Coordinates of C-alpha atoms and ligand atoms in Angstrom, one line a residue:
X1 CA -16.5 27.7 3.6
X2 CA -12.8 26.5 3.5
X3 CA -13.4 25.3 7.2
X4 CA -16.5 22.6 8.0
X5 CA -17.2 21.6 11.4
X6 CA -16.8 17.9 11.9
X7 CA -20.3 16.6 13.1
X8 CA -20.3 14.8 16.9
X9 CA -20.5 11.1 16.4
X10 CA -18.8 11.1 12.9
X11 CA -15.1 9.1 13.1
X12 CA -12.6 11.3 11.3
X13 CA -11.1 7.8 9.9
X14 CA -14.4 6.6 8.0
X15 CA -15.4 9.8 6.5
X16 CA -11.4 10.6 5.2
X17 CA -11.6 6.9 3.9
X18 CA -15.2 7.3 2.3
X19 CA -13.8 10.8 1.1
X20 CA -11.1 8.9 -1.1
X21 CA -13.5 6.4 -2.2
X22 CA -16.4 8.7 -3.2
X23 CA -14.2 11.9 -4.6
X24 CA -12.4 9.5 -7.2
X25 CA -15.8 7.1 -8.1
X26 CA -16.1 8.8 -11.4
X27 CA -12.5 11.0 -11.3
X28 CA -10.2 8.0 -11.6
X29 CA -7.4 10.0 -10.2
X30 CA -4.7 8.5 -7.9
X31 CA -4.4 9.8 -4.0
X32 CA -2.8 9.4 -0.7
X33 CA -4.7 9.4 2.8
X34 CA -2.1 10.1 5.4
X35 CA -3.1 9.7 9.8
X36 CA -1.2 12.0 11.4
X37 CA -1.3 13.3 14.9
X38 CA -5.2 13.1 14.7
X39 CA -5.5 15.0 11.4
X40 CA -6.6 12.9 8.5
X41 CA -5.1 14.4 5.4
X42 CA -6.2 13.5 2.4
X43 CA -3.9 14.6 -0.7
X44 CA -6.5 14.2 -3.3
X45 CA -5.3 13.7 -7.5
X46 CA -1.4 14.4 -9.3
X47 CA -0.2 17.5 -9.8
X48 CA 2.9 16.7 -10.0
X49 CA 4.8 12.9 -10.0
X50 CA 8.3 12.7 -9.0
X51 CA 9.5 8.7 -9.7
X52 CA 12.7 8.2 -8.5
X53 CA 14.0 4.7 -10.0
X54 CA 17.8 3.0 -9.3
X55 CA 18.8 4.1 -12.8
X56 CA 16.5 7.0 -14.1
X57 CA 14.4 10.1 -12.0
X58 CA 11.2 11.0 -14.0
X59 CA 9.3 14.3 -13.4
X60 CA 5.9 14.2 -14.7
X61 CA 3.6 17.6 -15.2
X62 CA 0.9 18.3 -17.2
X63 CA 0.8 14.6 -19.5
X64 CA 5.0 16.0 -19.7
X65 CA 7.5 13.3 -18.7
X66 CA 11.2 14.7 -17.6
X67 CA 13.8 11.6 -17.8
X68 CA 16.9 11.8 -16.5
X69 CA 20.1 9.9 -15.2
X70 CA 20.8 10.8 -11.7
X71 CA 24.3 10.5 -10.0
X72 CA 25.4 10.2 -6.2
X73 CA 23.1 9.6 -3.5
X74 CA 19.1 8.9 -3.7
X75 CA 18.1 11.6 -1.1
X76 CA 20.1 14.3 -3.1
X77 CA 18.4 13.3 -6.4
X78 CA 14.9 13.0 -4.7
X79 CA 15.4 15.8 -2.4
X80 CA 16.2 18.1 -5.6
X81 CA 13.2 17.2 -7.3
X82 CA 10.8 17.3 -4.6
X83 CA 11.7 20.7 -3.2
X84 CA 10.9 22.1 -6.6
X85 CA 7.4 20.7 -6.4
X86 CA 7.3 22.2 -3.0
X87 CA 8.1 26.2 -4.0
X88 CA 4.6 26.6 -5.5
X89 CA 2.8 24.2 -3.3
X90 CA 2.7 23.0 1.0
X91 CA 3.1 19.7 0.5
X92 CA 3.9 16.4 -0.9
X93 CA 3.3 13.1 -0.4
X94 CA 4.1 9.3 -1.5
X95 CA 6.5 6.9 -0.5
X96 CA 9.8 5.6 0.0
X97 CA 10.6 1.9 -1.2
X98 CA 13.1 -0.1 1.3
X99 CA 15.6 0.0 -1.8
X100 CA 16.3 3.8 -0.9
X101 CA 18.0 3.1 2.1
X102 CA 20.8 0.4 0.6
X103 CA 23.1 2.8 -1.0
X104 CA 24.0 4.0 2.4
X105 CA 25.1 -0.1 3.1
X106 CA 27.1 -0.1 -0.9
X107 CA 24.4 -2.6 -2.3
X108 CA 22.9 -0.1 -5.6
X109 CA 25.4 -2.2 -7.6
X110 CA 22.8 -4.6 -6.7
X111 CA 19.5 -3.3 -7.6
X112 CA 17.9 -4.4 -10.8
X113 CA 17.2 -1.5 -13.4
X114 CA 14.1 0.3 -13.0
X115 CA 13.9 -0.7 -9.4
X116 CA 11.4 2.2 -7.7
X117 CA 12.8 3.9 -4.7
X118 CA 10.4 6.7 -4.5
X119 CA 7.0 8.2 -5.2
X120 CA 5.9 11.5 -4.2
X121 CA 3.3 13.6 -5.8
X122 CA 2.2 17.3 -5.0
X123 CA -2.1 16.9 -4.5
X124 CA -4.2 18.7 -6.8
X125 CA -6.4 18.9 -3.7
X126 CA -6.5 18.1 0.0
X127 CA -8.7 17.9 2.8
X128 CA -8.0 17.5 6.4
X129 CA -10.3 15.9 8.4
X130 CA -10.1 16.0 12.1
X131 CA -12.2 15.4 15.5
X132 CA -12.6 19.4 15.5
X133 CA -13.1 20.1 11.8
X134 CA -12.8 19.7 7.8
X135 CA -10.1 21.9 6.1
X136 CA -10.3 22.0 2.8
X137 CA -7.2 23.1 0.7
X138 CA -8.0 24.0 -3.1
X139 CA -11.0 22.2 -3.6
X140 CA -13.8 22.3 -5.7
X141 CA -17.5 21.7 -6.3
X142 CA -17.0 17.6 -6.8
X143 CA -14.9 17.6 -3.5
X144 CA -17.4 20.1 -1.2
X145 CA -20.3 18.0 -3.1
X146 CA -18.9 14.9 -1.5
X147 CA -18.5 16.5 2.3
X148 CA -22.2 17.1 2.1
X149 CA -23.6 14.2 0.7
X150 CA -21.5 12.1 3.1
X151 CA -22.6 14.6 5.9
X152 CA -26.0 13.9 4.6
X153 CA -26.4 10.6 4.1
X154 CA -23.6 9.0 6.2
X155 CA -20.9 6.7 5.1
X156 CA -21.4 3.4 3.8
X157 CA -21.9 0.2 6.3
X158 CA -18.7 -1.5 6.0
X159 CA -20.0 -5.5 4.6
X160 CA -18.6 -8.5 6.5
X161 CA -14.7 -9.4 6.0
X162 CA -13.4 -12.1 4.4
X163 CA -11.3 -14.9 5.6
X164 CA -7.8 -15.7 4.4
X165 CA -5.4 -18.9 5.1
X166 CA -1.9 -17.7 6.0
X167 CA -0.4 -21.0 7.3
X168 CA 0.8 -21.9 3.9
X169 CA 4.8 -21.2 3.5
X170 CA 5.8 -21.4 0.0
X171 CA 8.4 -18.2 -0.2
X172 CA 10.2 -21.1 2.1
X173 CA 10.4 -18.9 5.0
X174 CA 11.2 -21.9 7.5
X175 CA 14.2 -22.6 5.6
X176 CA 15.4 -19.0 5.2
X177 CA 15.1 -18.5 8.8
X178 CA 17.6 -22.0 9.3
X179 CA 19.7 -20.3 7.1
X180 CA 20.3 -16.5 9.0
X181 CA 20.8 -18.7 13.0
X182 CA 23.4 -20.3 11.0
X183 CA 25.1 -17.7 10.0
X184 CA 24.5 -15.8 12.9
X185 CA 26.2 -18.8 15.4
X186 CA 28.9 -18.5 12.5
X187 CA 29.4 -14.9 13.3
X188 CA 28.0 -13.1 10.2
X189 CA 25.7 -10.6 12.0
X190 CA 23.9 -10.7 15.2
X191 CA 20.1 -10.0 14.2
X192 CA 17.9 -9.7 10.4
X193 CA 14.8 -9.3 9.6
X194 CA 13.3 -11.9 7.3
X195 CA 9.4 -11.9 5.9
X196 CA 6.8 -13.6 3.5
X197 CA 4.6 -12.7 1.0
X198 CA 1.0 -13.5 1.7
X199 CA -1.0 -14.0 -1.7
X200 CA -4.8 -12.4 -0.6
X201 CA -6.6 -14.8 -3.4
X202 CA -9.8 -12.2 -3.8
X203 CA -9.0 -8.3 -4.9
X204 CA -10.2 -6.1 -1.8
X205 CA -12.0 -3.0 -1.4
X206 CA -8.8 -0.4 0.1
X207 CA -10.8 1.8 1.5
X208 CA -13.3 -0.4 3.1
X209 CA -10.8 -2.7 4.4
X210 CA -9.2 0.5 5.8
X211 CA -11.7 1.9 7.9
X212 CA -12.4 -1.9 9.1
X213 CA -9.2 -2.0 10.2
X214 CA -8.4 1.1 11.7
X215 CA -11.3 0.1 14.1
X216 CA -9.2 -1.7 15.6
X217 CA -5.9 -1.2 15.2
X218 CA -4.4 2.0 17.2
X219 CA -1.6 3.1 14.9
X220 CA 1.4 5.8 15.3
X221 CA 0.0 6.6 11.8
X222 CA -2.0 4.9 8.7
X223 CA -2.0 5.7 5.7
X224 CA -4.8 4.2 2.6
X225 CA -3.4 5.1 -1.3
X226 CA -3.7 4.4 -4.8
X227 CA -0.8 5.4 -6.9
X228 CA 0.6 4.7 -10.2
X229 CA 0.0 1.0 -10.5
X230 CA -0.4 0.8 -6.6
X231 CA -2.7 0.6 -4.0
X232 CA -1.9 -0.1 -0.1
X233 CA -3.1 0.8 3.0
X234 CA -1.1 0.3 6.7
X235 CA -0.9 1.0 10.4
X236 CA 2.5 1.5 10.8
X237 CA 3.8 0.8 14.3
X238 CA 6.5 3.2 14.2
X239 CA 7.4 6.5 13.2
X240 CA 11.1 5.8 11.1
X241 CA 11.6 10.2 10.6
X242 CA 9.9 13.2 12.0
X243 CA 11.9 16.6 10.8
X244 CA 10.4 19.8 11.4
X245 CA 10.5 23.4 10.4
X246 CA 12.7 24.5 13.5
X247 CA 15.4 21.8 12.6
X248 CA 14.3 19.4 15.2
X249 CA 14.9 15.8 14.3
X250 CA 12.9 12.6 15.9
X251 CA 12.7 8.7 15.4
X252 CA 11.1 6.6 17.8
X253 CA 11.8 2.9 17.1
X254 CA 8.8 0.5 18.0
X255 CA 9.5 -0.9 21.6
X256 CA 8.8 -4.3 21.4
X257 CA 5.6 -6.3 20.6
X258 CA 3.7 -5.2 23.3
X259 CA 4.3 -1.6 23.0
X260 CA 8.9 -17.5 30.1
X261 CA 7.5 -14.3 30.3
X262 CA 10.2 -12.6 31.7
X263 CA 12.9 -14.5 29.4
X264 CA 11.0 -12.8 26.3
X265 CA 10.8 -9.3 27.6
X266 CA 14.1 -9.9 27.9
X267 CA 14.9 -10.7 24.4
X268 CA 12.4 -7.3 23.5
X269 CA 14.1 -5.2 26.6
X270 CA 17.3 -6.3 24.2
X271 CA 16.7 -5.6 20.9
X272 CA 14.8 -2.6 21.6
X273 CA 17.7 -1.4 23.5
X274 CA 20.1 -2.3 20.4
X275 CA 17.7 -0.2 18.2
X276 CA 17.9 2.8 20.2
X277 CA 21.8 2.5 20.5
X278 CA 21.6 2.3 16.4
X279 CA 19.1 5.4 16.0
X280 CA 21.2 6.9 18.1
X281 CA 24.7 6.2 16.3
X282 CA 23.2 7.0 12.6
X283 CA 21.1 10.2 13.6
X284 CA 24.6 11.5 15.2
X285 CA 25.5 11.5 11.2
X286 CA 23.0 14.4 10.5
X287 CA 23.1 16.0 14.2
X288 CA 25.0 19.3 15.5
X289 CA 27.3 18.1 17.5
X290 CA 26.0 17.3 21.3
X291 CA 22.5 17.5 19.9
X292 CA 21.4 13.6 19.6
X293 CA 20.1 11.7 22.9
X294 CA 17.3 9.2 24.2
X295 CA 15.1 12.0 25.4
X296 CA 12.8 9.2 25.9
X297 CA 12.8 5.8 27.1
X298 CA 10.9 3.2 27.2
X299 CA 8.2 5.4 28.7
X300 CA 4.3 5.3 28.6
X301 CA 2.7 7.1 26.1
X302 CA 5.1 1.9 25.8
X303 CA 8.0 4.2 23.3
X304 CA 11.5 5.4 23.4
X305 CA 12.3 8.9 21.0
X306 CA 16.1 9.4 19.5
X307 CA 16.1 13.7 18.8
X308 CA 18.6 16.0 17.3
X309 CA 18.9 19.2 15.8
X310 CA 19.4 18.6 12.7
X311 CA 22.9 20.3 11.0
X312 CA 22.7 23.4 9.4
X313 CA 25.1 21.4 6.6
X314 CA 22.5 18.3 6.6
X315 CA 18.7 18.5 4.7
X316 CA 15.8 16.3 5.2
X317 CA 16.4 13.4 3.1
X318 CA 20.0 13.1 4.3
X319 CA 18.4 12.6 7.9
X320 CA 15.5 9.8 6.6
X321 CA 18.8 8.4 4.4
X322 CA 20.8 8.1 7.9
X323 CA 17.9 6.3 9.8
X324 CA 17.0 3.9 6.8
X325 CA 16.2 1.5 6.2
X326 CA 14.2 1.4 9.9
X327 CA 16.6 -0.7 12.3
X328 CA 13.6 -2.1 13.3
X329 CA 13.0 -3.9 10.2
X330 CA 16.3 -4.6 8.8
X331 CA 19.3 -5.5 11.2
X332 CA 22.5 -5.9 13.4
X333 CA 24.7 -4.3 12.3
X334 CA 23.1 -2.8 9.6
X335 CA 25.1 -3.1 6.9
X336 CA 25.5 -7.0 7.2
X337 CA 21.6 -7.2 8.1
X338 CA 20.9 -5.3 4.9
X339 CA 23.0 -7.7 2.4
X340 CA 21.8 -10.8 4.5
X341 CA 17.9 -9.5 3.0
X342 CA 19.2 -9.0 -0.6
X343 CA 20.2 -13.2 -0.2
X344 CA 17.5 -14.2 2.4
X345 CA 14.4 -12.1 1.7
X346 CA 12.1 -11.9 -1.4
X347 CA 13.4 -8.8 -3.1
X348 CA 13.1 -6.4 -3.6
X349 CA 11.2 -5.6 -0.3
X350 CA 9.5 -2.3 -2.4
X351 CA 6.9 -0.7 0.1
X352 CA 7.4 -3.3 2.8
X353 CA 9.9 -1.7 5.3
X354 CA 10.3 1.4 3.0
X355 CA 8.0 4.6 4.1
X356 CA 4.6 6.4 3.8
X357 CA 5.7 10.2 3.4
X358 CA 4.5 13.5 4.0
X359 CA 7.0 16.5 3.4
X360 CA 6.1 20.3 3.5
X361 CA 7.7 23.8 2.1
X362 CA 8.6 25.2 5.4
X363 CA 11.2 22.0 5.3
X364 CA 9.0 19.6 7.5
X365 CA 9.1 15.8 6.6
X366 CA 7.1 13.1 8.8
X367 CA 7.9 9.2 7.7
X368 CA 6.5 6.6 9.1
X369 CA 7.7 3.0 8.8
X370 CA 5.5 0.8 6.5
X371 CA 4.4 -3.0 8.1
X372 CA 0.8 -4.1 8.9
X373 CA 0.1 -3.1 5.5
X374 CA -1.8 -4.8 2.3
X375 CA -0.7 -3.9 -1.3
X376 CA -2.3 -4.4 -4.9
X377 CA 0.2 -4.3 -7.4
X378 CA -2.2 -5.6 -11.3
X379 CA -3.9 -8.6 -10.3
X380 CA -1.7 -9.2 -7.4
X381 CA -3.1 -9.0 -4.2
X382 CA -0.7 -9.7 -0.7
X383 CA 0.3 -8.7 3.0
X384 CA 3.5 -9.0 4.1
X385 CA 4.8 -10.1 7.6
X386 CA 8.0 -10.5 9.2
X387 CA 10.2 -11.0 12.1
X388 CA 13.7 -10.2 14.3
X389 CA 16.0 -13.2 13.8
X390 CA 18.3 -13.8 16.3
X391 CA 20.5 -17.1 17.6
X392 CA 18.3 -18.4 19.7
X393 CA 15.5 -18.3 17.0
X394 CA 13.5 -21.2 15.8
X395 CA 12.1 -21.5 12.5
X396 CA 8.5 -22.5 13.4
X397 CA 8.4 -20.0 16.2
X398 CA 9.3 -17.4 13.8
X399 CA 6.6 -18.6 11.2
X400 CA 3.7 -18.4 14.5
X401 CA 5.1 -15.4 15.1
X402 CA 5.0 -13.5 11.4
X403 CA 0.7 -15.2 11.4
X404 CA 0.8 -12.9 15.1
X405 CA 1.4 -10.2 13.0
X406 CA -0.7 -10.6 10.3
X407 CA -4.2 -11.4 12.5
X408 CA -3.8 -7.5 12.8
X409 CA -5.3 -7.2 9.0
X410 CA -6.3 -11.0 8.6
X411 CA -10.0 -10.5 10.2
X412 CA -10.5 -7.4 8.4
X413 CA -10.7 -7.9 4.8
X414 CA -13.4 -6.3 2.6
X415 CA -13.6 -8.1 -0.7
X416 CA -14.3 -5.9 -4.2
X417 CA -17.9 -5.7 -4.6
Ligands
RVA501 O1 -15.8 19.1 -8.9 C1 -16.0 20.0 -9.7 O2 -15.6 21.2 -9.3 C2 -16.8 19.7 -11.0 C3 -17.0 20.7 -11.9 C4 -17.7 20.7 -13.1 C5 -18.5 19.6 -13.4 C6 -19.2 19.7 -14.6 C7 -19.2 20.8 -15.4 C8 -18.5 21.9 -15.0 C9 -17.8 21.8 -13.8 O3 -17.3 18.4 -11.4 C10 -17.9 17.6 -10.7 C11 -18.9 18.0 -9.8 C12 -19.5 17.2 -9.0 C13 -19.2 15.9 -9.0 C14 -18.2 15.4 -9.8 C15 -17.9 13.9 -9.7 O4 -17.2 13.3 -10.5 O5 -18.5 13.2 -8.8 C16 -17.5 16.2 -10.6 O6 -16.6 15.8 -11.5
RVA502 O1 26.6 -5.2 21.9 C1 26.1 -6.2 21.9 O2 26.5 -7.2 22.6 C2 24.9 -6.6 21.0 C3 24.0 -7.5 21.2 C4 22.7 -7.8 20.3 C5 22.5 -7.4 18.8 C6 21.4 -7.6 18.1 C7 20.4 -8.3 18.7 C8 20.4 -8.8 20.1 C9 21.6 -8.5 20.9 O3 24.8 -5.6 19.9 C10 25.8 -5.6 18.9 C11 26.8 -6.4 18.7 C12 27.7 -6.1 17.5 C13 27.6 -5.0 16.8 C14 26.5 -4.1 17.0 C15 26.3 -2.9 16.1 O4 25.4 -2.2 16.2 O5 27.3 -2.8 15.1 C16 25.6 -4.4 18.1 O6 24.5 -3.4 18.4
VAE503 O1 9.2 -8.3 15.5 C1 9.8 -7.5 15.7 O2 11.0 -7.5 15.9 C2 9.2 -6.0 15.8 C3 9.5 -5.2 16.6 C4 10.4 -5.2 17.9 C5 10.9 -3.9 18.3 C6 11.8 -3.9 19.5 C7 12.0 -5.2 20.3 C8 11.5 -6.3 19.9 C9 10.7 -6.4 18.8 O3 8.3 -5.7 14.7 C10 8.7 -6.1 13.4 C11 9.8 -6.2 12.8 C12 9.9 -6.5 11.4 C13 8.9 -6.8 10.7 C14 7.6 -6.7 11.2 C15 6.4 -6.9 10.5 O4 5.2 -6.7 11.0 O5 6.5 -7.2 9.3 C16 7.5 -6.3 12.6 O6 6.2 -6.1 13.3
MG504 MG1 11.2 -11.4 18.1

């Protein structure tokens, strides 16, 4: 009965989506609903909370709060932590704030108190759900009660979306795109990442708007959660960390846009090339020697993949410390790209850029970069969008480009009912 067979016609996406929704109508408990290689996996309640903060690492169990100050680098402190949760369960799941990977670039002196770099919880329950079948993983009668009904009765009709109007710049991202090609033509750094805040001025249904927009978007993953004071939901275009058991280490860094018109698949040929050449310099960090190379790239799949074997004197959180934050999303060179953020971006960036993560026992860990994603934070409701700054960048292009981005989600907001 652990093992339900997943009815033909039934998308796994909408019935793991309606799963969340449905399982926690009445249970308001908090959960996590990672895509992953086809397999939906649900991480349903809080067993156990691990908060990692810039000054403090909280351990919560049982209505029990653990505080504590925590010293040297944020993977060691959150790595500790989380592979105690993981001795009496398989796996864990949250998410990683773009504020982890800054120590690596000396800029904690720079983080506000209480900033969050981490989330990760062990489920009470999960349930996998899958083209070939429903695995369910310490469930009860609310959660088997659910499959069946659903089963039964089908998922809900998703209502019509809402519009939203994102042509209006007041985070001034125009002007903070004037200032990065002026200090890149002064010789500063060659290429950052700069975004805005989009204010969604209606509170929308998360998992509604998910399924709508997984219809059509094609993601590397997606992820829909509610956690601690947060919901979100993604489809992240890249896949920032991939350890498993074995030691093997991957990161694929997205390939361009696409993944006159020859000049801009130039410019993507470019910095997707400069990406690759960074994966590969950082994950050399964590590698056995001759280990790390481009076993991949740019081939169709359009991707390029970075591997190692991971060192025996390296852990998992080291390896998602060396590859943060994402190239793809911050800069070149990283460290200058980074800082030039912390001056030229709204921060901190929080989710946006950080990571949705799933970790297990056996010592597997599979992150994947967070963009094309909507967050609720009390009240607040926004998307986020972004772009690569270079030179030759023009401020109004930029701004077109960041609304490109965001026309991904845009059309396919489900307003709270
Ligand atoms: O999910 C159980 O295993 C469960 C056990 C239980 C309930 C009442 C009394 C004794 C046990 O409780 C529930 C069952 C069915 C639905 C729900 C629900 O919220 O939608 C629920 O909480
Ligand atoms: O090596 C180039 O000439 C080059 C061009 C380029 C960079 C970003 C965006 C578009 C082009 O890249 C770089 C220049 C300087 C430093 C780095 C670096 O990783 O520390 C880098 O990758
Ligand atoms: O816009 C690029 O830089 C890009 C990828 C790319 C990768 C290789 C070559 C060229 C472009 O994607 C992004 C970068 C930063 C932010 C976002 C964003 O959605 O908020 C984004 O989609
Ligand atoms: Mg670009």
């Amino acid at each position: 009965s652990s093992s339900i067979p997943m009815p033909a016609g039934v998308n796994p996406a909408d019935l793991a989506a309606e799963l969340a929704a449905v399982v926690t109508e009445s249970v308001d408990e908090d959960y996590l609903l990672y895509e992953c290689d086809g397999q939906w996996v649900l991480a349903a309640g809080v067993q156990a909370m691990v908060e990692l903060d810039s000054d403090e690492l909280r351990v919560i169990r049982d209505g029990v709060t653990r505080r504590q100050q925590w010293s040297g680098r944020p993977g060691a402190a959150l790595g500790e932590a989380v592979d105690r949760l993981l001795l009496e369960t398989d796996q864990a799941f949250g998410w990683v704030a773009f504020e982890f990977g800054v120590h690596r670039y000396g800029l904690q002196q720079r983080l506000a108190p209480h900033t969050p770099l981490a989330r990760v919880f062990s489920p009470r329950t999960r349930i996998m759900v899958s083209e070939k079948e429903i695995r369910l993983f310490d469930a009860g009668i609310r959660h088997r009660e659910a499959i069946d009904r659903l089963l039964a009765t089908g998922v809900r009709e998703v209502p019509q979306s809402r519009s939203v109007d994102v042509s209006d710049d007041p985070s001034g991202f125009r002007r903070r795109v004037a200032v990065a090609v002026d200090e890149i033509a002064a010789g500063r750094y060659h290429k950052v990442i700069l975004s805005r805040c989009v204010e969604v001025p209606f509170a929308i249904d998360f998992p509604l708007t998910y399924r709508l927009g997984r219809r059509h978007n094609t993601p590397v993953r997606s992820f829909l959660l509610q956690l601690g004071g947060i919901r979100a939901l993604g489809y992240s275009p890249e896949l920032v960390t991939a350890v498993r058991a074995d030691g093997v280490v991957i990161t694929e860094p997205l390939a361009g846009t696409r993944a006159d018109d020859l000049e801009s698949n130039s410019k993507e040929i470019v910095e997707h090339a400069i990406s690759v050449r960074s994966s590969l310099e950082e994950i050399t960090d964590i590698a056995e020697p001759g280990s790390a190379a481009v076993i991949d790239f740019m081939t169709v799949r359009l991707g390029s993949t970075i591997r190692a074997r991971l060192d025996p004197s390296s852990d998992r959180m080291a390896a998602l410390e060396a590859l943060f934050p994402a190239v793809t999303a911050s800069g070149i060179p990283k460290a200058a790209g980074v800082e030039a953020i912390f001056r030229l971006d709204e921060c901190p960036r929080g989710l946006y850029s950080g990571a949705v993560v799933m970790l297990s026992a056996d010592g597997g860990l599979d992150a994947a970069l967070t963009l094309r994603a909507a967050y609720q934070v009390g009240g607040r409701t926004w998307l986020r969008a972004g772009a690569g700054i270079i030179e030759e960048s023009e401020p109004e292009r930029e701004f077109e480009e960041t609304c490109e981005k965001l026309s991904t989600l845009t059309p396919y907001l489900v307003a709270r009912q």
